[PDB]
Design a protein around this ligand. Structure first.
Ligand SMILES: CCS(=O)(=O)c1ccc(CC(=O)Nc2nc(-c3ccccc3)c(C(=O)c3ccccc3)s2)cc1
Lengths: 8, 245
């Protein structure tokens, strides 16, 4: 997910 | 059991994280107070399609949210939580933080908000078709401005808005409880120095922020049924991940 991506 | 020094350096890391991620400098917001949407401009906005007004707003919120994600990423304790719990808190709290941050961009004197480069009243937003929600946000920002938060207080209060052990779906509820308390200690500790603790009883009722965010998600449900293609083709994927079902 995007939140996961934004978080690393 | 965090020592006074550990609590002091938690204050430090929160206020620094906020400084670095505050999106607009407060003075740039205050400087722009004199720049106000004129009659024709306000009419122009009112006469926009719903799809276009929502799409503009979705972009501006996404941009605000990107700064909140960064704020969390730099928050001492947040990255030490499990991945699931990081997602859970951000999904529930990103918008809440933004709404708190936005009181900085609310001018209580003429009852306007900084939007697309100028200040405008709540009627600017009519094309959205959720005037009750918008008026509620204006009332909320009005109520927050009367507390005259400093930037450090916003930092500390938004950290707490975000680190909320009461969110459903947490895999490690106890870890979040511990961080939250240390942050409450941090907030109290900072308010004591400045002799500012009398704002605590004037803070928004628990539930009020969650309520505003709930209304928002609901008005996006109405809009998405009316324009499902616009949301799919033109809305930021992040916004969709956060607020769409
Ligand atoms: C937030 C960090 S900051 O540095 O203080 C900061 C950075 C950039 C801005 C400009 C900006 O984006 N202004 C916006 N204001 C509203 C808005 C709309 C209605 C009422 C109150 C605010 C926006 C929305 O789309 C929106 C739509 C629905 C619900 C709620 C909001 S976007 C402002 C502050």
């Amino acid at each position: 997910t995007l939140l996961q991506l934004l978080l690393g | 059991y965090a020592s006074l020094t550990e609590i002091e350096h938690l204050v430090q890391s929160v206020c620094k994280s906020y400084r670095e991620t505050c999106q607009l400098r407060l003075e740039d917001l205050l400087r722009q107070r004199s720049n106000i949407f004129s009659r024709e401009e306000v009419t122009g906005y009112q006469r926009k399609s719903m799809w276009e007004m929502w799409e503009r707003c979705a972009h501006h919120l996404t941009e605000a949210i990107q700064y909140v994600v960064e704020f969390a990423k730099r928050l001492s304790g947040f990255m030490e939580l499990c991945q699931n719990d990081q997602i859970v808190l951000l999904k529930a709290g990103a918008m809440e933080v933004v709404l708190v941050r936005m009181c900085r961009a609310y001018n209580a004197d003429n009852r306007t908000v900084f939007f697309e480069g100028k200040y405008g009243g709540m009627e600017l937003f009519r094309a959205l078709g959720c005037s009750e929600l918008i008026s509620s946000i204006f009332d909320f920002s009005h109520s927050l401005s009367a507390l005259h938060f400093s930037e450090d207080e916003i930092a500390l209060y938004t950290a707490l808005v975000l680190i909320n052990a009461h969110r459903p779906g947490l895999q490690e509820k106890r870890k979040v409880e511990q961080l939250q308390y240390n942050l409450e200690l941090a907030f109290h500790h900072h308010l004591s120095k400045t002799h500012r603790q009398s704002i605590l009883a004037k803070l928004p009722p628990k539930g009020k922020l969650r309520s505003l965010c709930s209304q928002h998600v609901e008005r996006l449900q109405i809009f998405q049924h009316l324009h499902p293609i616009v949301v799919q083709a033109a809305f930021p994927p992040l916004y969709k991940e956060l607020f769409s079902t």
